């Protein structure tokens, strides 16, 4: 099965998922000097005030904080998007060391981690239908650098010991994802894909320019998670990031000068 090891990592994924070599794969390097300011891009609208978190799950590749997406409660709109996209889950990608971990890069710079807030286009009715469409998902990507702690991340960090291994889940209600956002919503945007198999080319990527700061202690606790299940040999959940993929015939647009 696919993963992030030497024998099943990103360079192998194309054998089971040929779209891995497709025309709009993610992540990508964001060349800040080549990204063009697009004055027709609108400000992002992130409306998370009624968000209903439910559960946190170790799925063997990351941990997902899942939300109730059966109603328009936490939605992303505006920016490059047409229509309304409902928050379904967030997760992170991170490194074994502070010098790597992000999926997107900025002028080849790798951040310590990257948060993905995953939303699906309500015009397709559910997430499974949305991923079959070129405009089915909108993922808000936020870089993490190591410095001061992020207070709004700590509730996530403190439950991780209860979902150490693949397949474990825990109740995770009343979590407010507004506490994970930076001050500015300036962003880059481009058409791309899921960054894990099945690598479907269904994502409008919206990557915020401003990173959030998290503490060394916070990210160290991410790195104590396991890819393996309980009672299997321990393999630390680290370096669960796909490297940058060819940009091909795409333009990255900036919302800001
Ligand atoms: N796998 C990821 O690792 N990063 S992502 O592209 O935000 C994502 C979005 C939805 C489904 C699978 C996902
Ligand atoms: Zn992701």
PDB file of C-alpha atoms and ligand atoms in Angstrom:
ATOM      1  CA  UNK A   1       0.000   0.000   0.000  1.00  0.00           C
ATOM      2  CA  UNK A   2       1.211   3.535  -0.674  1.00  0.00           C
ATOM      3  CA  UNK A   3       2.945   5.545   2.013  1.00  0.00           C
ATOM      4  CA  UNK A   4       6.030   7.651   2.676  1.00  0.00           C
ATOM      5  CA  UNK A   5       8.740   4.991   2.992  1.00  0.00           C
ATOM      6  CA  UNK A   6      11.557   4.196   0.581  1.00  0.00           C
ATOM      7  CA  UNK A   7       9.662   1.375  -1.092  1.00  0.00           C
ATOM      8  CA  UNK A   8       6.167   2.899  -1.202  1.00  0.00           C
ATOM      9  CA  UNK A   9       6.735   6.675  -1.149  1.00  0.00           C
ATOM     10  CA  UNK A  10       5.912   9.440  -3.626  1.00  0.00           C
ATOM     11  CA  UNK A  11       8.255   8.200  -6.367  1.00  0.00           C
ATOM     12  CA  UNK A  12       6.320   4.911  -6.472  1.00  0.00           C
ATOM     13  CA  UNK A  13       2.758   6.278  -6.434  1.00  0.00           C
ATOM     14  CA  UNK A  14       2.470   6.542 -10.221  1.00  0.00           C
ATOM     15  CA  UNK A  15       2.401   2.756 -10.614  1.00  0.00           C
ATOM     16  CA  UNK A  16      -0.968   2.433  -8.886  1.00  0.00           C
ATOM     17  CA  UNK A  17      -2.081   6.035  -9.604  1.00  0.00           C
ATOM     18  CA  UNK A  18      -0.873   7.058 -13.081  1.00  0.00           C
ATOM     19  CA  UNK A  19      -2.382  10.549 -12.618  1.00  0.00           C
ATOM     20  CA  UNK A  20       0.659  11.134 -10.383  1.00  0.00           C
ATOM     21  CA  UNK A  21       2.357  12.263 -13.625  1.00  0.00           C
ATOM     22  CA  UNK A  22      -0.624  14.351 -14.722  1.00  0.00           C
ATOM     23  CA  UNK A  23      -0.989  17.915 -15.894  1.00  0.00           C
ATOM     24  CA  UNK A  24      -2.202  19.569 -12.658  1.00  0.00           C
ATOM     25  CA  UNK A  25      -0.487  17.767  -9.780  1.00  0.00           C
ATOM     26  CA  UNK A  26       0.216  19.218  -6.341  1.00  0.00           C
ATOM     27  CA  UNK A  27       2.088  20.454  -4.446  1.00  0.00           C
ATOM     28  CA  UNK A  28       4.204  22.908  -6.407  1.00  0.00           C
ATOM     29  CA  UNK A  29       6.941  25.389  -5.733  1.00  0.00           C
ATOM     30  CA  UNK A  30       5.581  28.926  -5.589  1.00  0.00           C
ATOM     31  CA  UNK A  31       8.039  31.172  -7.398  1.00  0.00           C
ATOM     32  CA  UNK A  32       7.104  34.488  -5.824  1.00  0.00           C
ATOM     33  CA  UNK A  33       8.635  36.593  -8.575  1.00  0.00           C
ATOM     34  CA  UNK A  34       6.766  34.727 -11.345  1.00  0.00           C
ATOM     35  CA  UNK A  35       3.358  34.669  -9.617  1.00  0.00           C
ATOM     36  CA  UNK A  36       1.263  37.452 -11.094  1.00  0.00           C
ATOM     37  CA  UNK A  37      -0.901  39.785  -9.072  1.00  0.00           C
ATOM     38  CA  UNK A  38      -4.467  39.376 -10.306  1.00  0.00           C
ATOM     39  CA  UNK A  39      -6.532  42.442  -9.292  1.00  0.00           C
ATOM     40  CA  UNK A  40      -9.717  40.587 -10.268  1.00  0.00           C
ATOM     41  CA  UNK A  41      -9.195  38.149  -7.373  1.00  0.00           C
ATOM     42  CA  UNK A  42     -11.495  38.908  -4.485  1.00  0.00           C
ATOM     43  CA  UNK A  43     -10.702  38.698  -0.781  1.00  0.00           C
ATOM     44  CA  UNK A  44     -11.164  35.288   0.712  1.00  0.00           C
ATOM     45  CA  UNK A  45     -14.259  34.785   2.842  1.00  0.00           C
ATOM     46  CA  UNK A  46     -13.565  32.299   5.646  1.00  0.00           C
ATOM     47  CA  UNK A  47     -16.756  31.838   7.689  1.00  0.00           C
ATOM     48  CA  UNK A  48     -15.937  29.417  10.512  1.00  0.00           C
ATOM     49  CA  UNK A  49     -18.057  30.894  13.346  1.00  0.00           C
ATOM     50  CA  UNK A  50     -20.525  27.977  13.346  1.00  0.00           C
ATOM     51  CA  UNK A  51     -17.998  25.222  12.703  1.00  0.00           C
ATOM     52  CA  UNK A  52     -18.826  21.899  14.365  1.00  0.00           C
ATOM     53  CA  UNK A  53     -15.814  19.669  14.900  1.00  0.00           C
ATOM     54  CA  UNK A  54     -16.605  16.044  15.671  1.00  0.00           C
ATOM     55  CA  UNK A  55     -13.642  13.711  15.813  1.00  0.00           C
ATOM     56  CA  UNK A  56      -9.915  13.374  15.313  1.00  0.00           C
ATOM     57  CA  UNK A  57      -8.601  10.322  13.452  1.00  0.00           C
ATOM     58  CA  UNK A  58      -5.142   8.861  12.804  1.00  0.00           C
ATOM     59  CA  UNK A  59      -5.630   7.466   9.292  1.00  0.00           C
ATOM     60  CA  UNK A  60      -2.120   6.046   8.924  1.00  0.00           C
ATOM     61  CA  UNK A  61      -0.865   9.007   6.858  1.00  0.00           C
ATOM     62  CA  UNK A  62      -1.790  12.052   8.986  1.00  0.00           C
ATOM     63  CA  UNK A  63      -4.391  12.962  11.588  1.00  0.00           C
ATOM     64  CA  UNK A  64      -7.679  14.470  10.394  1.00  0.00           C
ATOM     65  CA  UNK A  65      -9.877  16.739  12.480  1.00  0.00           C
ATOM     66  CA  UNK A  66     -13.304  16.078  10.997  1.00  0.00           C
ATOM     67  CA  UNK A  67     -16.287  18.423  10.909  1.00  0.00           C
ATOM     68  CA  UNK A  68     -20.037  18.107  10.468  1.00  0.00           C
ATOM     69  CA  UNK A  69     -20.464  18.981   6.780  1.00  0.00           C
ATOM     70  CA  UNK A  70     -24.178  18.097   6.561  1.00  0.00           C
ATOM     71  CA  UNK A  71     -25.061  21.829   6.616  1.00  0.00           C
ATOM     72  CA  UNK A  72     -23.480  25.147   5.594  1.00  0.00           C
ATOM     73  CA  UNK A  73     -21.795  25.795   8.945  1.00  0.00           C
ATOM     74  CA  UNK A  74     -18.116  26.415   8.142  1.00  0.00           C
ATOM     75  CA  UNK A  75     -17.642  27.628   4.591  1.00  0.00           C
ATOM     76  CA  UNK A  76     -15.044  29.082   2.302  1.00  0.00           C
ATOM     77  CA  UNK A  77     -16.109  31.420  -0.494  1.00  0.00           C
ATOM     78  CA  UNK A  78     -14.786  34.320  -2.512  1.00  0.00           C
ATOM     79  CA  UNK A  79     -11.201  34.545  -3.570  1.00  0.00           C
ATOM     80  CA  UNK A  80     -10.851  32.599  -6.833  1.00  0.00           C
ATOM     81  CA  UNK A  81     -13.892  30.480  -6.039  1.00  0.00           C
ATOM     82  CA  UNK A  82     -17.357  30.408  -7.520  1.00  0.00           C
ATOM     83  CA  UNK A  83     -19.929  29.151  -5.089  1.00  0.00           C
ATOM     84  CA  UNK A  84     -19.697  27.811  -1.590  1.00  0.00           C
ATOM     85  CA  UNK A  85     -17.318  25.202  -0.226  1.00  0.00           C
ATOM     86  CA  UNK A  86     -17.976  23.363   3.054  1.00  0.00           C
ATOM     87  CA  UNK A  87     -15.221  22.465   5.516  1.00  0.00           C
ATOM     88  CA  UNK A  88     -14.962  18.683   5.907  1.00  0.00           C
ATOM     89  CA  UNK A  89     -11.621  18.205   7.671  1.00  0.00           C
ATOM     90  CA  UNK A  90      -8.198  19.615   8.335  1.00  0.00           C
ATOM     91  CA  UNK A  91      -4.838  17.898   8.711  1.00  0.00           C
ATOM     92  CA  UNK A  92      -1.132  18.665   8.541  1.00  0.00           C
ATOM     93  CA  UNK A  93       1.990  17.467   6.780  1.00  0.00           C
ATOM     94  CA  UNK A  94       5.269  17.738   8.710  1.00  0.00           C
ATOM     95  CA  UNK A  95       8.909  16.744   8.800  1.00  0.00           C
ATOM     96  CA  UNK A  96      11.342  14.766  10.906  1.00  0.00           C
ATOM     97  CA  UNK A  97      13.278  18.044  11.353  1.00  0.00           C
ATOM     98  CA  UNK A  98      12.251  21.698  11.390  1.00  0.00           C
ATOM     99  CA  UNK A  99      13.964  22.264   8.013  1.00  0.00           C
ATOM    100  CA  UNK A 100      11.370  20.256   6.062  1.00  0.00           C
ATOM    101  CA  UNK A 101       7.749  19.193   6.216  1.00  0.00           C
ATOM    102  CA  UNK A 102       5.695  21.449   3.981  1.00  0.00           C
ATOM    103  CA  UNK A 103       4.334  20.263   0.647  1.00  0.00           C
ATOM    104  CA  UNK A 104       4.212  23.591  -1.104  1.00  0.00           C
ATOM    105  CA  UNK A 105       7.455  25.534  -1.078  1.00  0.00           C
ATOM    106  CA  UNK A 106       8.067  29.264  -1.515  1.00  0.00           C
ATOM    107  CA  UNK A 107      11.075  30.084  -3.679  1.00  0.00           C
ATOM    108  CA  UNK A 108      12.210  26.527  -2.819  1.00  0.00           C
ATOM    109  CA  UNK A 109      11.916  27.197   0.931  1.00  0.00           C
ATOM    110  CA  UNK A 110      10.423  24.301   2.913  1.00  0.00           C
ATOM    111  CA  UNK A 111       8.496  25.112   6.077  1.00  0.00           C
ATOM    112  CA  UNK A 112       8.360  22.870   9.144  1.00  0.00           C
ATOM    113  CA  UNK A 113       4.776  21.874   8.375  1.00  0.00           C
ATOM    114  CA  UNK A 114       1.699  22.744   6.339  1.00  0.00           C
ATOM    115  CA  UNK A 115      -1.962  22.819   7.409  1.00  0.00           C
ATOM    116  CA  UNK A 116      -4.640  21.846   4.870  1.00  0.00           C
ATOM    117  CA  UNK A 117      -8.228  22.937   5.511  1.00  0.00           C
ATOM    118  CA  UNK A 118     -10.243  20.840   3.056  1.00  0.00           C
ATOM    119  CA  UNK A 119     -13.552  22.092   1.659  1.00  0.00           C
ATOM    120  CA  UNK A 120     -15.933  20.680  -0.977  1.00  0.00           C
ATOM    121  CA  UNK A 121     -18.131  22.496  -3.464  1.00  0.00           C
ATOM    122  CA  UNK A 122     -21.747  22.241  -2.329  1.00  0.00           C
ATOM    123  CA  UNK A 123     -23.030  22.175  -5.890  1.00  0.00           C
ATOM    124  CA  UNK A 124     -21.852  18.539  -6.065  1.00  0.00           C
ATOM    125  CA  UNK A 125     -23.798  17.444  -2.978  1.00  0.00           C
ATOM    126  CA  UNK A 126     -21.116  15.401  -1.185  1.00  0.00           C
ATOM    127  CA  UNK A 127     -17.341  15.053  -0.949  1.00  0.00           C
ATOM    128  CA  UNK A 128     -17.195  11.830  -2.971  1.00  0.00           C
ATOM    129  CA  UNK A 129     -18.936  13.448  -5.932  1.00  0.00           C
ATOM    130  CA  UNK A 130     -16.918  16.650  -5.562  1.00  0.00           C
ATOM    131  CA  UNK A 131     -13.550  14.907  -5.937  1.00  0.00           C
ATOM    132  CA  UNK A 132     -14.655  13.777  -9.411  1.00  0.00           C
ATOM    133  CA  UNK A 133     -14.879  17.379 -10.616  1.00  0.00           C
ATOM    134  CA  UNK A 134     -12.170  19.856 -11.646  1.00  0.00           C
ATOM    135  CA  UNK A 135     -13.635  22.477  -9.281  1.00  0.00           C
ATOM    136  CA  UNK A 136     -14.750  20.067  -6.584  1.00  0.00           C
ATOM    137  CA  UNK A 137     -12.465  20.998  -3.701  1.00  0.00           C
ATOM    138  CA  UNK A 138     -10.882  24.133  -2.293  1.00  0.00           C
ATOM    139  CA  UNK A 139      -7.948  23.544   0.039  1.00  0.00           C
ATOM    140  CA  UNK A 140      -6.679  26.400   2.183  1.00  0.00           C
ATOM    141  CA  UNK A 141      -2.999  25.761   2.835  1.00  0.00           C
ATOM    142  CA  UNK A 142      -1.171  27.479   5.691  1.00  0.00           C
ATOM    143  CA  UNK A 143       2.541  27.175   6.400  1.00  0.00           C
ATOM    144  CA  UNK A 144       3.900  26.492   9.894  1.00  0.00           C
ATOM    145  CA  UNK A 145       7.267  27.822  11.060  1.00  0.00           C
ATOM    146  CA  UNK A 146       8.845  27.025  14.409  1.00  0.00           C
ATOM    147  CA  UNK A 147       9.038  29.878  16.915  1.00  0.00           C
ATOM    148  CA  UNK A 148       6.371  31.008  19.359  1.00  0.00           C
ATOM    149  CA  UNK A 149       3.578  28.592  20.270  1.00  0.00           C
ATOM    150  CA  UNK A 150       0.200  28.798  18.535  1.00  0.00           C
ATOM    151  CA  UNK A 151      -2.292  28.820  21.418  1.00  0.00           C
ATOM    152  CA  UNK A 152      -5.157  27.639  19.210  1.00  0.00           C
ATOM    153  CA  UNK A 153      -3.202  24.534  18.192  1.00  0.00           C
ATOM    154  CA  UNK A 154      -2.623  23.246  21.713  1.00  0.00           C
ATOM    155  CA  UNK A 155      -5.970  21.434  22.048  1.00  0.00           C
ATOM    156  CA  UNK A 156      -5.006  19.404  18.975  1.00  0.00           C
ATOM    157  CA  UNK A 157      -1.529  18.644  20.302  1.00  0.00           C
ATOM    158  CA  UNK A 158      -2.875  17.500  23.655  1.00  0.00           C
ATOM    159  CA  UNK A 159      -5.195  14.823  22.230  1.00  0.00           C
ATOM    160  CA  UNK A 160      -2.549  13.207  20.002  1.00  0.00           C
ATOM    161  CA  UNK A 161      -1.425  10.721  22.655  1.00  0.00           C
ATOM    162  CA  UNK A 162      -4.927   9.200  22.443  1.00  0.00           C
ATOM    163  CA  UNK A 163      -4.658   8.561  18.674  1.00  0.00           C
ATOM    164  CA  UNK A 164      -1.064   7.399  18.504  1.00  0.00           C
ATOM    165  CA  UNK A 165      -1.575   4.616  15.967  1.00  0.00           C
ATOM    166  CA  UNK A 166      -3.357   4.066  12.665  1.00  0.00           C
ATOM    167  CA  UNK A 167      -7.115   3.616  12.988  1.00  0.00           C
ATOM    168  CA  UNK A 168      -7.479   5.247  16.386  1.00  0.00           C
ATOM    169  CA  UNK A 169      -9.951   8.085  16.774  1.00  0.00           C
ATOM    170  CA  UNK A 170     -11.135  10.294  19.603  1.00  0.00           C
ATOM    171  CA  UNK A 171     -14.029  12.654  20.191  1.00  0.00           C
ATOM    172  CA  UNK A 172     -12.960  16.177  19.294  1.00  0.00           C
ATOM    173  CA  UNK A 173     -15.909  18.535  19.674  1.00  0.00           C
ATOM    174  CA  UNK A 174     -15.994  22.311  20.079  1.00  0.00           C
ATOM    175  CA  UNK A 175     -12.661  22.981  18.375  1.00  0.00           C
ATOM    176  CA  UNK A 176     -12.495  26.402  16.701  1.00  0.00           C
ATOM    177  CA  UNK A 177     -10.319  26.368  13.550  1.00  0.00           C
ATOM    178  CA  UNK A 178     -10.236  30.170  13.507  1.00  0.00           C
ATOM    179  CA  UNK A 179      -7.448  29.754  16.059  1.00  0.00           C
ATOM    180  CA  UNK A 180      -5.188  28.279  13.344  1.00  0.00           C
ATOM    181  CA  UNK A 181      -5.375  31.245  10.920  1.00  0.00           C
ATOM    182  CA  UNK A 182      -2.713  33.930  10.493  1.00  0.00           C
ATOM    183  CA  UNK A 183      -3.592  37.609  10.572  1.00  0.00           C
ATOM    184  CA  UNK A 184      -3.488  38.188   6.803  1.00  0.00           C
ATOM    185  CA  UNK A 185      -5.516  36.304   4.217  1.00  0.00           C
ATOM    186  CA  UNK A 186      -3.230  37.297   1.314  1.00  0.00           C
ATOM    187  CA  UNK A 187      -2.831  34.207  -0.864  1.00  0.00           C
ATOM    188  CA  UNK A 188      -1.542  32.500  -3.975  1.00  0.00           C
ATOM    189  CA  UNK A 189      -3.885  30.297  -6.006  1.00  0.00           C
ATOM    190  CA  UNK A 190      -3.535  27.690  -8.746  1.00  0.00           C
ATOM    191  CA  UNK A 191      -5.402  24.593 -10.020  1.00  0.00           C
ATOM    192  CA  UNK A 192      -4.055  21.322  -8.643  1.00  0.00           C
ATOM    193  CA  UNK A 193      -4.714  17.969  -7.044  1.00  0.00           C
ATOM    194  CA  UNK A 194      -4.926  15.987  -3.869  1.00  0.00           C
ATOM    195  CA  UNK A 195      -1.418  15.442  -2.540  1.00  0.00           C
ATOM    196  CA  UNK A 196      -2.084  11.813  -1.548  1.00  0.00           C
ATOM    197  CA  UNK A 197      -3.480   8.953  -3.638  1.00  0.00           C
ATOM    198  CA  UNK A 198      -5.818   8.966  -5.458  1.00  0.00           C
ATOM    199  CA  UNK A 199      -4.153  12.285  -6.475  1.00  0.00           C
ATOM    200  CA  UNK A 200      -7.357  13.482  -8.156  1.00  0.00           C
ATOM    201  CA  UNK A 201      -7.103  16.741 -10.094  1.00  0.00           C
ATOM    202  CA  UNK A 202     -10.027  18.369  -8.319  1.00  0.00           C
ATOM    203  CA  UNK A 203      -8.498  21.131  -6.132  1.00  0.00           C
ATOM    204  CA  UNK A 204      -8.428  24.899  -6.285  1.00  0.00           C
ATOM    205  CA  UNK A 205      -5.406  25.536  -4.070  1.00  0.00           C
ATOM    206  CA  UNK A 206      -5.390  28.686  -1.962  1.00  0.00           C
ATOM    207  CA  UNK A 207      -2.056  29.015  -0.137  1.00  0.00           C
ATOM    208  CA  UNK A 208      -1.700  31.804   2.409  1.00  0.00           C
ATOM    209  CA  UNK A 209       1.438  33.920   2.233  1.00  0.00           C
ATOM    210  CA  UNK A 210       1.689  34.483   5.991  1.00  0.00           C
ATOM    211  CA  UNK A 211       2.832  31.431   8.003  1.00  0.00           C
ATOM    212  CA  UNK A 212       1.648  30.696  11.489  1.00  0.00           C
ATOM    213  CA  UNK A 213       4.193  30.161  14.233  1.00  0.00           C
ATOM    214  CA  UNK A 214       4.108  27.000  16.349  1.00  0.00           C
ATOM    215  CA  UNK A 215       6.512  25.999  19.077  1.00  0.00           C
ATOM    216  CA  UNK A 216       9.191  23.341  18.828  1.00  0.00           C
ATOM    217  CA  UNK A 217       7.311  21.454  21.557  1.00  0.00           C
ATOM    218  CA  UNK A 218       4.094  21.498  19.522  1.00  0.00           C
ATOM    219  CA  UNK A 219       5.671  20.057  16.388  1.00  0.00           C
ATOM    220  CA  UNK A 220       7.706  17.555  18.426  1.00  0.00           C
ATOM    221  CA  UNK A 221       4.418  16.053  19.559  1.00  0.00           C
ATOM    222  CA  UNK A 222       3.238  15.641  15.956  1.00  0.00           C
ATOM    223  CA  UNK A 223       6.386  13.560  15.442  1.00  0.00           C
ATOM    224  CA  UNK A 224       5.460  11.113  18.218  1.00  0.00           C
ATOM    225  CA  UNK A 225       2.517   9.809  16.224  1.00  0.00           C
ATOM    226  CA  UNK A 226       2.841   6.472  14.413  1.00  0.00           C
ATOM    227  CA  UNK A 227       2.143   5.416  10.842  1.00  0.00           C
ATOM    228  CA  UNK A 228       1.656   1.836  12.069  1.00  0.00           C
ATOM    229  CA  UNK A 229      -1.262   0.297  13.893  1.00  0.00           C
ATOM    230  CA  UNK A 230      -1.239  -0.750  17.532  1.00  0.00           C
ATOM    231  CA  UNK A 231       0.848  -3.844  18.151  1.00  0.00           C
ATOM    232  CA  UNK A 232       2.909  -3.340  14.994  1.00  0.00           C
ATOM    233  CA  UNK A 233       6.551  -2.228  14.798  1.00  0.00           C
ATOM    234  CA  UNK A 234       6.760   1.474  15.557  1.00  0.00           C
ATOM    235  CA  UNK A 235       7.356   3.770  12.600  1.00  0.00           C
ATOM    236  CA  UNK A 236       7.176   7.423  13.551  1.00  0.00           C
ATOM    237  CA  UNK A 237       4.733   9.516  11.547  1.00  0.00           C
ATOM    238  CA  UNK A 238       7.217  12.022  10.111  1.00  0.00           C
ATOM    239  CA  UNK A 239       7.977  13.293   6.605  1.00  0.00           C
ATOM    240  CA  UNK A 240       4.415  12.659   5.421  1.00  0.00           C
ATOM    241  CA  UNK A 241       4.812  15.247   2.654  1.00  0.00           C
ATOM    242  CA  UNK A 242       4.835  14.889  -1.117  1.00  0.00           C
ATOM    243  CA  UNK A 243       7.574  16.974  -2.795  1.00  0.00           C
ATOM    244  CA  UNK A 244       6.904  19.711  -5.332  1.00  0.00           C
ATOM    245  CA  UNK A 245       5.652  18.530  -8.728  1.00  0.00           C
ATOM    246  CA  UNK A 246       6.128  20.099 -12.169  1.00  0.00           C
ATOM    247  CA  UNK A 247       4.054  23.220 -12.714  1.00  0.00           C
ATOM    248  CA  UNK A 248       3.493  22.380 -16.397  1.00  0.00           C
ATOM    249  CA  UNK A 249       0.947  24.624 -18.125  1.00  0.00           C
ATOM    250  CA  UNK A 250      -0.218  26.493 -15.044  1.00  0.00           C
ATOM    251  CA  UNK A 251       0.047  30.019 -13.688  1.00  0.00           C
ATOM    252  CA  UNK A 252       0.121  30.850 -10.010  1.00  0.00           C
ATOM    253  CA  UNK A 253      -1.857  34.011  -9.235  1.00  0.00           C
ATOM    254  CA  UNK A 254      -1.352  36.317  -6.250  1.00  0.00           C
ATOM    255  CA  UNK A 255      -4.102  38.199  -4.468  1.00  0.00           C
ATOM    256  CA  UNK A 256      -1.661  40.883  -3.347  1.00  0.00           C
ATOM    257  CA  UNK A 257       1.005  43.203  -4.689  1.00  0.00           C
TER     258      UNK A 257
HETATM  259  N1  LIG B   1      -4.969  14.252   0.939  1.00  0.00           N
HETATM  260  C1  LIG B   1      -3.807  15.239   1.306  1.00  0.00           C
HETATM  261  O1  LIG B   1      -2.812  14.776   1.720  1.00  0.00           O
HETATM  262  N2  LIG B   1      -3.737  16.731   1.133  1.00  0.00           N
HETATM  263  S1  LIG B   1      -5.055  17.461   0.460  1.00  0.00           S
HETATM  264  O2  LIG B   1      -4.632  17.506  -0.947  1.00  0.00           O
HETATM  265  O3  LIG B   1      -5.432  18.688   1.137  1.00  0.00           O
HETATM  266  C2  LIG B   1      -6.428  16.299   0.728  1.00  0.00           C
HETATM  267  C3  LIG B   1      -7.684  16.926   0.341  1.00  0.00           C
HETATM  268  C4  LIG B   1      -8.735  15.846   0.270  1.00  0.00           C
HETATM  269  C5  LIG B   1      -8.421  14.337   0.221  1.00  0.00           C
HETATM  270  C6  LIG B   1      -7.179  13.703   0.429  1.00  0.00           C
HETATM  271  C7  LIG B   1      -6.243  14.829   0.823  1.00  0.00           C
HETATM  272 ZN1  LIG B   2      -2.855  17.547   2.882  1.00  0.00          ZN
END
